[PDB]
Amino acid sequence: AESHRLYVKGKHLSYQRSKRVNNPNVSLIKIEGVATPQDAQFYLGKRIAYVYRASKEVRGSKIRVMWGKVTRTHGNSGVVRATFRNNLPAKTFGASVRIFLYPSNI
């Protein structure tokens, strides 16, 4: 059809941090349509991909992926914590990420 999307949209908000120090090893993700930790518990363990473009072709593509997963909730408003194999660059604060439906408990 007109759509082929099998993922939920999210935004990379920032790193885990206190007022004056941050921890790049953990990222905070805001998933679309999620407003409570009770709803965010559905997405725990789901794979997250940050998909971006580069001008130089590598292995037959100009599209590069950074993989990670959802680990736990954060706060009272549906924000979750995520960990990636390589930490997100921090230029991506406010960029889009894809939360896939696998591994599936449904």
Binding site: K11, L13, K30, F93, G94, S96
Partner: protein
């Protein structure tokens, strides 16, 4: 979920609207604000004028052209209120600020677009009835803005055109509703009602 969110600034409180818009820009949402001259500030007109005159007092003594710059337009007053909440000396803050546009009135092409409101910043939903409030257009005119009449005339012309458009749209909506209401007895309509649609 829109790529661009157009906010009608009429009836909103400046500080709360600035806070929510600054958070949206930091999260990476593109926002246009229209009709900034119809924004509201809680408190009386003399109080808000006094605060702006204190701001006018602030200036660099040995060279005024280096000092704080006092922009008089309502859109710029709102922009100052938001820049105070964005960390604007960093690249991240500048990038967030560059996802924002503020206008007086509704210029093209935004006059033909959908405009939304922010309920947590609305005056009728926030302020207690009876508390005094201030209109940003009057405040800006008192502190030196010189385009209130031009904006008013252009807004009146826009309102006339939009009223004609709405009249045509309402006639079409009535025709569509009449054509749809006469098919509510069909088996397809019964099945959709059973399924909830």
């Amino acid at each position: 979920v829109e790529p661009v969110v157009v906010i009608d600034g009429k009836g909103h409180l400046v500080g709360r609207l600035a806070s929510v818009v600054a958070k949206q820009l930091l999260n990476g949402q593109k926002i246009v604000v229209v009709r900034a001259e119809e924004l509201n500030i809680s408190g009386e007109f003399f109080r808000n004028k006094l605060k702006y005159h204190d701001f006018l007092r602030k200036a660099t003594a040995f060279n005024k052209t280096r000092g704080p710059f006092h922009f008089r337009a309502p859109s710029r007053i709102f922009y100052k209120a938001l820049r105070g909440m964005v960390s604007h000396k960093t690249a991240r803050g500048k990038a967030a600020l560059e996802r924002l546009k503020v206008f007086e009135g509704i210029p093209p092409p935004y006059d033909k677009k959908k405009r939304v409101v922010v309920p947590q910043a609305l005056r009728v939903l926030r302020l207690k009835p009876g508390r005094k409030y201030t209109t940003l257009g009057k405040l800006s005119t008192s502190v030196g803005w010189k385009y209130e009449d031009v904006v008013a005339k252009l807004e009146a012309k826009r309102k006339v055109s939009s009223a004609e458009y709405y009249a045509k749209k309402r006639a079409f909506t009535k025709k569509v509703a009449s054509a749809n209401a006469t098919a509510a007895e069909s088996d397809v309509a019964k099945q959709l009602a059973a399924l909830g649609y």
